[PDB]
Amino acid sequence: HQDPWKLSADKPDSNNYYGETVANGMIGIISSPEPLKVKEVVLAGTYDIYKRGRVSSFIPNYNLLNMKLAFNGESVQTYNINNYKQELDMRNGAFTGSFQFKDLATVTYSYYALRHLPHCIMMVVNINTQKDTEINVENLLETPSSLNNQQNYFQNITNTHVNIPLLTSVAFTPTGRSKIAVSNTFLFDEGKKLQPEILHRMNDADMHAMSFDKKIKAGKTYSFALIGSLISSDHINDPYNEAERLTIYAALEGKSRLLNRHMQEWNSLWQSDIQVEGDPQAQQDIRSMLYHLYSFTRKSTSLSPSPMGLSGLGYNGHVFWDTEIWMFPPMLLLHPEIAKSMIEYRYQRLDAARKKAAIYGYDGAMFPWESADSGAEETPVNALTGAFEHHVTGDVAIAAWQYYLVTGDKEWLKEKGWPILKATAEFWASRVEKNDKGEYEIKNVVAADEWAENIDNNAYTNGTAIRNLQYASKCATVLGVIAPKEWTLIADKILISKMSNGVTREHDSYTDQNIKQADANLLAYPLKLITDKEQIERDLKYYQTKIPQSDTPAMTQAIFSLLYSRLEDSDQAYHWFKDAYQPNLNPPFRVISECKGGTNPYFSTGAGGVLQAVIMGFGGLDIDAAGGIKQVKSVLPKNWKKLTITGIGIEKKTFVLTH
Amino acid sequence: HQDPWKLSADKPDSNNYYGETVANGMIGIISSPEPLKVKEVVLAGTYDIYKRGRVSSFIPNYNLLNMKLAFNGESVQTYNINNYKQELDMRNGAFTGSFQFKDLATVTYSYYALRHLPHCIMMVVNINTQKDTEINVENLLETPSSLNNQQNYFQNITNTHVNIPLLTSVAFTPTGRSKIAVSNTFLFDEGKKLQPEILHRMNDADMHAMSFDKKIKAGKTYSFALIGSLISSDHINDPYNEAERLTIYAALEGKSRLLNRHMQEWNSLWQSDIQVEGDPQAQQDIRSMLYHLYSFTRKSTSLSPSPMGLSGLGYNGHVFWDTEIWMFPPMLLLHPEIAKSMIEYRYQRLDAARKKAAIYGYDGAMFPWESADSGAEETPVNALTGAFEHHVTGDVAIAAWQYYLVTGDKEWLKEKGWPILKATAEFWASRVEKNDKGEYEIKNVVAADEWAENIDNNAYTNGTAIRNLQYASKCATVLGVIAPKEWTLIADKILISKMSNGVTREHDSYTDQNIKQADANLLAYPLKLITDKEQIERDLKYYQTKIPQSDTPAMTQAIFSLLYSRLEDSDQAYHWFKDAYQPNLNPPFRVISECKGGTNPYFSTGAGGVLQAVIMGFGGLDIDAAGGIKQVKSVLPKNWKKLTITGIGIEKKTFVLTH
Amino acid sequence: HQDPWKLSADKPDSNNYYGETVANGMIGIISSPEPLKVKEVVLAGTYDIYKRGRVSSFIPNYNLLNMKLAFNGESVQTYNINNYKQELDMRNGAFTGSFQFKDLATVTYSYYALRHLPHCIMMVVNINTQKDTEINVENLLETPSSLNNQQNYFQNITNTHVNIPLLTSVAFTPTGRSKIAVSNTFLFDEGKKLQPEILHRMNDADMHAMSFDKKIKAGKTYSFALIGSLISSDHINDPYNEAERLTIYAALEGKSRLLNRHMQEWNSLWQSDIQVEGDPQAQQDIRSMLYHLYSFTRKSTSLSPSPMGLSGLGYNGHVFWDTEIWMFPPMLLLHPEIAKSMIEYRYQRLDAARKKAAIYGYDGAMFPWESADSGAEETPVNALTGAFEHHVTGDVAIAAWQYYLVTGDKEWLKEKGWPILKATAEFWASRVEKNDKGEYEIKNVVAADEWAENIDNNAYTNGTAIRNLQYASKCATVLGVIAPKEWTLIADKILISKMSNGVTREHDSYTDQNIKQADANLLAYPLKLITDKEQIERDLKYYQTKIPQSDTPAMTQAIFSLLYSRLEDSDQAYHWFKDAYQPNLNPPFRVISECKGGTNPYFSTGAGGVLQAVIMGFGGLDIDAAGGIKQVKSVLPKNWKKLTITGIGIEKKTFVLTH
Structure with a gap:
């Protein structure tokens, strides 16, 4: 089950099964262990009040592919099929x-979140019978209990050439905020006169x-498609x-x-790839990580992935810094x-x-901790x-x-980068407090280490404020606009403190507490505020054992990997x-949970971090502060003979690393 | 009944009557054969789900002018009046x-969609008595069955000088999408103390x-107005x-x-006019065409006409290419x-x-077949x-x-033209498919000849793609931008094929089928991709008899006229x-139906086509590819002694043509 | 009672009590004579149909500070307390x-509309015991009858360190247009384990x-805070x-x-201040005027004050020219x-x-008489x-x-000032009529003297049309854009006439009528179209006799003052x-009513005018037609030994005047 392009499961065990996702950045379909069923369907950009957190959420949607197949009135069940297999082809x-139905017939079904049509799904069904037989096929549109006020329609769209039967439902999200419509049809090869009623x-x-019913003759394959x-x-x-x-x-x-269109768009995504020689499990795992990031994002949109992308309702579908710092960097290098x-x-x-900045007493733009449709704060109030x-x-x-560093797009910097950098720098300029010694403090935050609440001068937070102020000033220089000189003065005096052993202090109350996730170590990567290799090493030695095994998300060990x-x-x-992902895996497709031994896949944030460990760590690739992609010193795992990374930067460079 | 400024009807026949429209580009009022009634009122820009097509539609509105008049308690009806006449004065x-009521009085009523006040209507009523009489006058506000949840109000607005009685209704469109309000008052000459209760x-x-009631002595004129x-x-x-x-x-x-304001604005519109000597019926018909386009459009707005303008709910009030290609060109030349x-x-x-482009898997801007409020696709799904x-x-x-060519407004080109041309070119660049021979194909469209469905390389469609890519490239140059070289490469290799007789092939499946309307001939005009006079003629000879007499809209014969x-x-x-309009007329005002012998006036699209046959055909006027208006060789009908076209281009030039 | 920073009332008299406001430009809280209650709470920016005028209005909101205090089960009331005092500290x-409660305790409560947190209020309560006592404290959230469909919630927000009990209500404005949420908590000093249940x-x-209940021993201070x-x-x-x-x-x-944050922001606001030596009542009154304008506005927003700011529902909370001409000028000089x-x-x-311009048949931008949420006209239809x-x-x-003149911000002029000036100039160019003598009239207006209705060539109106046209033309020159030459042509020929007594005529029907407020005098200040001191004196001496004592708003006498x-x-x-404000005062805090002997405070329009009389009048400060602030000839009242004005213009200049 270590094909470098395909994840495969023989005889799915429903008592120990975590479904895989196919998605096009707009619709996600999560697999069921049951044949011809799907477990869950999620539509991006649709949020309403629903269950967790009393805030907006993704909504379980129509399981629109759900099908029932019978042979001579006998419905397909577990007890009457054999050689039942599932496969995810990551190429497309x-x-x-x-599966084989008794000794009578073989059935294959493949489904797709069509890559070029954001709102369209297709399932193709092929049935080969060894004897004359009649199939009964049913497509069910069940309104999930997440929706209300449903209406169930059916009509025929006809002309002299076609009869397109449409099975349609329309329903509402819990508060009525969003109207959902789903419309399905069957496609046949045999043409209007011969197609089934x-x-x-x-x-x-x-x-x-x-x-419908259809007679199939001995040794003939009958094919039909469901489009939704x-x-x-x-x-x-x-x-x-x-x-x-x-x-x-x-x-x-x-x-x-x-x-064909679907294949063309998938071929284009895979023009940026990571090839590992000497470690088939690593090759497959890394392809799965790229596959999920490619499936959970979409070029030429304003969509951003949640921590679980389109794999389900993880973190209510909200957008976090999980995008900016975890999923965004590998996607910027592979597909800007x-x-x-x-x-x-x-x-x-x-x-x-x-x-948000104005409501909380600050200047400029204060991005929310959790974002959804509006860009207002969506974090559950209890957090x-x-x-x-x-x-x-x-x-x-x-x-x-x-x-801007990776693309060099100065028109984008003028129109979009600068509005963000200017407003966010204005926020930090209003957020800091000057003390007696002329230093700038950022008091009363929750740390990147979220176990540290209502503390002062968090290492990571202060580091992001410095970088925000520096980058806004640099941007002003590039575009020929005059930046407030206060931004540089503040950046140079924001407190980052050391303990007596010379280790970067996580916050002003920090001694040796366990931490949820990397915080001080993030000043080394990604922020590169700490470049002295002895400082990087003493920070790793002090903090690497501070992260407990339990209830700690996959936002740590990939950074440790990269820094080593x-x-x-x-x-x-x-x-x-x-350690970053293998202890987080769920069967049978090695999907990734948030925490070690966790049961909430697919944590795309974790995949994004590990991809940085591979690309920026093992590959040595780095965003040069002066612009473009550079390569710094790196090592490979002992057992990796070759690492090949394709499609990097706007020049689409290939990097090959060997021992 | 051939006055060059007025359309007149003696004794309306309600069994054979198609009402005329007065409109200011915002409200249209369609006439009733009944005295002091209107058949229908339409408000531009108000769409909701209603009847035809299961998509948004214009909504029949308050017949706000409806009045009942009694003389000595005897109700005025078609059955008890004589010398009843209706007239539309196209000048204003x-x-x-x-009409005459028995031996008591002559009644004259005139109504107007006020040209300067988009939301205001006025009816003026004059009663000229031959005997002492008492009138009872009632203004009715009936909520049409298209509206729901109505409220019916009445109040007096007073000060020391006036008592303005307001009759108001508020109601909703079928889904609650739009709240409509109507408010009416009577105006009297006699002043607050003497006006009727x-x-x-x-x-x-x-x-x-x-x-109200009013006693009028014999031999007096009593006047009142209704404002709504x-x-x-x-x-x-x-x-x-x-x-x-x-x-x-x-x-x-x-x-x-x-x-006075109403007159001033209409006088300005008629400073662009078409004068025909030698054919009073042509002079009146052409004035009617100009009058309907002027009534169904409005300067200084973002309004666009439906194929039926404000004459009713034709094609749900949706905006089609009927504007861009049929109604827009004559208006660009007369009133930019x-x-x-x-x-x-x-x-x-x-x-x-x-x-739309993103939903259908394309780049850039994909304008909808039918547009209404949002600019999303509004075509009925069965079409x-x-x-x-x-x-x-x-x-x-x-x-x-x-x-841009006609106005030379480079600021408009920068702010609005280029955003349109760039996005639409990006669409065509994503819509074409390159074949083995290096040609570009546009596969699986409905042709301008809409009887040809799901065919390949439609002549008109491919021509519009060529022009869009060429014009976007030219626009980029005017603004000092380098257009993607791909636009010219594609434009130069988009397939336009000939049949073995050298005739432009309508599409890849086309031999000799009847066609709904002009398609290949549109490559000659308006696209001017075909300029060779022998090729124009070969295409006319082959296609001119392909359009059946029945169920073919007025989007063909005007182009044939212009080309001849x-x-x-x-x-x-x-x-x-x-042939373009005379077989499509409805009595008693020679309104134009969509098809020959049709009964769905007023087809403003057909008037726009005929006005091009007159201005660009008989007048020889043409949009110069290098900018402004030029004049090419033309002829007049034998029976026309002179054709005079005023107010052409930004120089407001007059063109005179004789034999 | 004449402290220069504090307004004081001893034993509030509920039969003769006009409450004072604390506000942060977003929330206003109007005082009750009853202890630990508030009369009214107004939220800026929230409008719905409600009572007066049948148009959108501010909505009475949750009295979120309402508290009931009992000592040993005995309810605190006005009737059983003694030495009860109220005080507004204008500094913060x-x-x-x-108050004293019998022999048990002294109670002090202070509340704030937090200056840095636009949506947050705080009340701090101090109980100083003379005997052992037990307090029962209740905070009530009563849904006002202005709101509907309320829900009442309560929950505990906890972690190892805190238990934050939240009392929350959610409700709707009358038509459901706006959803209101309020959430309150108690803050204690003693910590989670010891704080009251x-x-x-x-x-x-x-x-x-x-x-909650709290036992307090004799001789102790117990403090708690209410945040909402x-x-x-x-x-x-x-x-x-x-x-x-x-x-x-x-x-x-x-x-x-x-x-601390609250004080920092109020300290900043008071860096712009007016100091009067030798007149303590004037000192306090001028502080109250600055205090109300500072409380009723907010930097870095798109909020504009109503004539009553956040003091209540005066004029439905709508925005009038009361901002542009009355409250805006003093704020532009003190805090741009x-x-x-x-x-x-x-x-x-x-x-x-x-x-609005389009609906009334004009070009450009026609600002409404009364504005609220959308910017559409909100004047009651009966006015x-x-x-x-x-x-x-x-x-x-x-x-x-x-x-622009005061800031010299050319980027603002390009992005915001020019769009306003260009569109408003286009309105006036479409609003004038040229007469037979080549002069420009503006006919059928209501005058600045609103007693003159549906009259022609109002002096003030014609003056603003001239300045609008001139400033749009000067703006075009600053930005290097071509203005229509018609703007200057029209501006030079707009009619302003004198009567045969050498006095500027208010309108074309004016001879000797009583006038509601200043109109022709405004051509001297603020418009400075009349600079001839003899014409200023003539217009002053005439019109100052025409203002009746009754039903005349505080938009007059302040200008008389400034010009003298x-x-x-x-x-x-x-x-x-x-005369401008002293006859309009309400006890016990000297709040200002709209009219002499009025009972509708606080008329911040009136305060705006008087601040101009002080700053531009006594201080001689003036917006220079060429940019920045200049100082012309002025005098001080006999009894004022010194006038000091700080924080003036973008240079933050101090001006000292003496006899």
């Missing part, structure tokens, strides 16, 4: 199930279905009509043209247009950040991160400057690489 | 009825009325209060000031500020076109045009570029000019 | 009450409460969660940190960043002014000012140009300075 995000049943309040479109009032004013329009459009494009969408998300929410974890503003500034790679320590770098 | 959009009745759920304001939440946040404010304002202005409003409609909806008729994007680009004028063939040009 | 907007009662439909956050959907998408988040934030900042917010309010409402008092458009233009100050006549200047 195809999720395939295959489609029946419609509405037997339940929350479910309707379309169905899923869209909301967050995406279009009239989702009901747009869903039916899209499904009609996709039906008359046809399966071939749809899969993905990074551009992530920062566009923030640019279009700058108004909401100015409003003190929302009111007090202020480094997110610096994290947004850092990503915006990095975008920069120190040219192969044994420590590889130890921390494995 | 006055609709006038006049105004009674209010609320006897029905869906109707209330204000009324009609506005919605689409136009103003508080329509209820703003309707009352507007009616009070208009009442205090008075009839004389209102009609009207053309500016039409293209402003599209500029304001550029973000909705970007959203494949909405998903597949893509030339509308090129049509918007062509109009944008022509606006350009070929200096007076007999063919005049044949096609008459 | 602290409202303090203090907080009980919650929900006994009424419209009220819930949180309460008040916010709406007009301010934030999710007011419910944002109110709770803000109160948690404020609780974990704590009383000391909040008051306050003036910037006031003009930002108009800039962000330019689209609505363009819409003709809404449709007909047109000088407001010139008033906005004047303020926009003055902002400019002519160097102390006795007259001082007479009109006193």
Whole structure:
């Protein structure tokens, strides 16, 4: 099960199964262990009050691919199939199930979140029978209990050439905030006169279905497709009509043209790749990390991923610094247009950040700890991160400057980077307090180490304020605008303190407490405020054992790996690489949970960190403060013969590393 | 009935009557055969789900002018009046009825959609007595069944000088999308103390009325006016209060000031005119065409006409390429500020076109087949045009570029034209497919000939893509920007094929099918991709008999006329000019239906086409590719002694043509 | 009772009591004569249909500070306390009450509209015991009858260190337009383990409460604080969660940190101050005027004050020219960043002014007589000012140009000032009529003297049209853009006439009528179209006799004062300075009513005028037509030994004047 392009599971065990996701950055479909079913469907950009946190959330959506297959009236069940296998093809995000029904027939089904059509899904079903047989096929549209006020429709769209039967539902999110429409059709090869008659049943309040029968002859394969479109009032004013329009459009494009477009967009994503010689498990794991980041982002949008991307309702679908510092850097090096969408998300929410700053008594733009539709603060009120974890503003500034460093797009810096950098620098200039000694303090925050609450002069927070102020000043210079000279004066005097052993102090109350995640070590990478290798090493030695095994998220060990790679320590770098994700895995597809032994995949934030350990750590790739991508000294794991990284920077460079 | 300024009807026949429209580009009022009634009122910019197509629509509104008149308690009806006449004065959009009631009085009523006050209507009533009589006058506000949740109000607005009685209704469009308010008052000459007492009745759920009595001695003229304001939440946040404010304002202005401003604005519109010597019927018909375009548009707005303007709910009030290619060109030459409003409609909806392109898997801006409030796709889902008729994007680009060519407004090109041309070119660059031979194809469209569905390389569509890419490239140069070299490479290699007889092929599946309307011939005019006179002629000979007599819209024969004028063939040009509209007329005012023998006037699209046959065909006027208006060779109909076109181009040039 | 920083009342008389306001430009809290109660709370920016005028209004909000205090089960009332005093400290907007309860304790309470946290309020209560006692403390959240569909919540926010009990309500404005959230907590000094248990009662439909008991030994001080956050959907998408988040934030900042931040911001505001030597009552009155303008405005916003600021529902909270001409000039000289917010309010409402112009048949931007949320007209329909008092458009233009003169901010002129000046100039160019003598008239207005309705060529109106046209032309020159030459042509020929007595004629129907307020005198100041001191004196001597004692607002005598100050006549200047506000005062805090003997305080318009009489009049300070502030000839009242004005202009200049 160590194909470098395919994740595979034989006989899914429903008692120990964590589904995999196919997604196009707009819709995510999470697999079921049951044949011809999906577990959960998530639509990006649709938020309403729902369950966790009493704040906006992603909403479980229509399981629009759900199918029932019968042979001569006998429904497919666990007890009557064999050689049941699932496979995820990471080359094209195809999720395939295959099984034999008794000794009678073989069934394959592949489904796709179409890469070029953000709101369109397709499942292709192939049935090969060894004897004459009749199939009954049903597609069910069950309204999930997350939605209300549903309506269940069915109609025929016809002309002299086609009969497109549409199974449509329209429903609302819990508070009525968003109207959802879904529209499904069956595609046949045999043409209007010979295609099966489609029946419609509405037997339940929350479910309707379309169905057909088809005679298949011995030794013949019968193929059909299910196309679905899923869209909301967050995406279009009239989702009901747009869903039916899209499904009609996709039906008359046809399966071939749809899969060809899908393949072309996936081929383009995989022009940036990471190849490992000598470690098939690492090769597959790293492909899975790239696959999930590619599936959970979309170029040419203003979409940003949640910590769980489109794998479910993890962290309510909210956007955190998990994007800017964890998922954004590897995407900026491999596909700058993905990074551009992530920062566009923030640019279009700058108004909401100015409003938050004003409500909390500050100048400029104060980005929220958790962001959703509006860009207003969305953190559950019971979590003190929302009111007090202020480094997110610096994290947004850092990503915006990095975008310009890697692309050199000065028109983007004028139109979007500078508005962000100027407003965020104005925030920090208003956020600091000058003390007796002329130093600048940032008092009463929640640390990057979120176990440290309502403390002063957090190392990471203060570091992000310094970088935000420096980068805003640098930006002003590049564009020929005059920056307040106070920004540089403040940056040079923001407190970063050492304990008596010379170790960077996490905050003013810090001695030897356990910490949730990397904080002081982040001043070495990503901030590069600490470059002295002896300082980097003494900070690693003091803090690396401060992170407990339990209830600590995957936002630490990838940084330890990267820093040990920069120190040219192969044994420590590889130890921390494995520790970053292997103890977090869930079967049968090695999806990644947030914490060690956790059960909440897929934590895309964790994948983003590990990709930095591979690209920036083992590959030595670095955003040069002066612009572009440079390469610094690195080591490989002992057992890696070659590391090849393709599509890096706007010159699309290939880097090869060997021992 | 061939007055060059007035359309007149004696004794309206309600069994064979198609009403005429007065409009100010915001409100349209369509005439009733019944005296002192109107059939329908339409407010621009107000759309909701209603009847046809399951998509947004114009909504029948308050018939706010409806009046009941009694003489000595005897109700005035079609059955008991004589010498009843109706007249539309095209000089000032006055609709006038006049009749005799027995031996008592002559009644004249004139109503107006006030040209300067977009939301204000006025009816003026004169009663000339032959005997002593008492009139009872009632103004009815009946909530049409298109509206719901109505409220019926009445109050006196007073000071020492006035008593302004306001009859107000507020109601909602079917889904609650739009709140409509209407407020009416009576104006009297005799002043506060002597004016009639105004009674209010609320006897029905869906109707209330204000009324008065007045004794008039024999041989006197008694005059009163009704002023109404009609506005919605689409136009103003508080329509209820703003309707009352507007009616009070208009009442205090008075009839004389209102009609003087109205006259001044209509006089300005008619400073661009078409004068024909030798053909009184042509002179009246052409004045009717100009009058309807002037009535159905408004300078200094973001309004664009539907194919039926404000004559009713034709095509749901949606905006089509009917504006860009059919109504826009004659308005650009006569009144560029009207053309500016039409293209402003599209500029304001550029973000909705970007959203459509993303949903359908393209780059840039994909303008919708049918547009309404948002600029999202509004085509009924049962019509494949909405998903597949893509030339509308090129049509918007062509109009944008022509606006700049005619005005030379480089500031408008920078702020609005270029955003349109750049985004629409980016769409076409993403829409084409390169083939093995290095040609660019546009596969799977609905043709301009909409009977050809899901075909490849439509002539008109491919031509609009070429022009969009060429004009965007030219625009970039005017503004000192380097357009992507790909735009010219694609433009130069987009497929336009010929059949073995050398005739331009309509699409890759086209041999000799009947066609709905002009498609390949549009490559000659308006696109001017075909300039060779033998090629123009070969294409006319092959396609001119491909358009059936039945169920074919007025989007063909005007182009045939214009092309035969350009070929200096007076007999063919005049044949096609008459065929373009005369078989489409409805009595008694020669309004134009969409198709031959049709009954759905007024098809403003057809008038726009015919006005191009007159201005660009008979007049030889042409948009110069290098800027401004030029004149090419033309002919007149044999029976036209002189054609005079005034107010052309930003120099407001007069063109005179004789034999 | 004549402290230069504090307003004091002994034993409030509920039968003759006009409450004083503490405000931060977002929340106003108006005092009750009853201990530990507030009369009214107003939230800026929240408007809905409510009572007066049938148009949008400020809404009475939660009296969130309402407290009930009992000693040994005995309820504290006005009738059983003694030595009860109230005091407003203008230095920090602290409202303090203090009283003795029998032989048990002294109670002191101080409340604040926190200056740095626009949505946060704090009350601090100190109990100083003379005997052992037990207090019962209740904080009540009563939903006012202005709101509907309330919900009453209570929860504990806890961690190892804190238990923050939140008393929260959520409700809606009358039409459901706005959702309001309020969240309160108690702060204690003693810590989580020792703090009182907080009980919650929900006994009424419209009220819930949180309460505690505390035993206090004799001779001890016990202190507690109430913090509350008040916010709406007009301010934030999710007011419910944002109110709770803000109160948690404020609780974990704590009383000391909040008051320090509050004091810092009030210290900054008072860096611009007016010091009078030899007249303690004038010193205190002028402080009260500065205090109210500082409390009723907020830098770095788009808020503009109503005529009553946040003192209540006066004039529905609508924005009038009372800002541009009355409150804006003193704030522009003292704190340009306050003036910037006031003009930002108009800039962000330019689209609505363009819409109003279009609806009334004009070009450009027509600012409404009364403005609220959208910028559309909000004047009650029964008042003709809404449709007909047109000088407001010139008033906005004047303020926009003055902002540029005083700041010299050319980037602001390009982005905001020019859009205002260009559109308002276009309005006036479309508003004038040229007569047979080549002069420009403005006909059928309501005058600045609002008693003159539907008249022609109002002096002040014509003056503002001239300045608007001139300043738009000067603006075009500053930015190097071409202005229509018609603006200068029109400005030079707009009619301002003299009657046969050599007095400027108010309008074309004016001879000797009583006038509501200053009109023709405003051509001298502020417009400075009349600089001839003899014409100023003629207009002064005539019109100063025409203002009746009754029903005439404080928009007159302050100008008389300033002009007599400019002519160097102390006795007259001082007479009109006193008449401007002293006859409009309400006890016991000398709050200002709109009219002489009025009962509708606080008329901040009136304070604005008088501050101009002091700064521009007695101080001789003037906005120089060429940029910055200059000083012309002035006099002081006989009895004033010295006038000092600090923080003037962007140079922050101090001006000292003596006899």
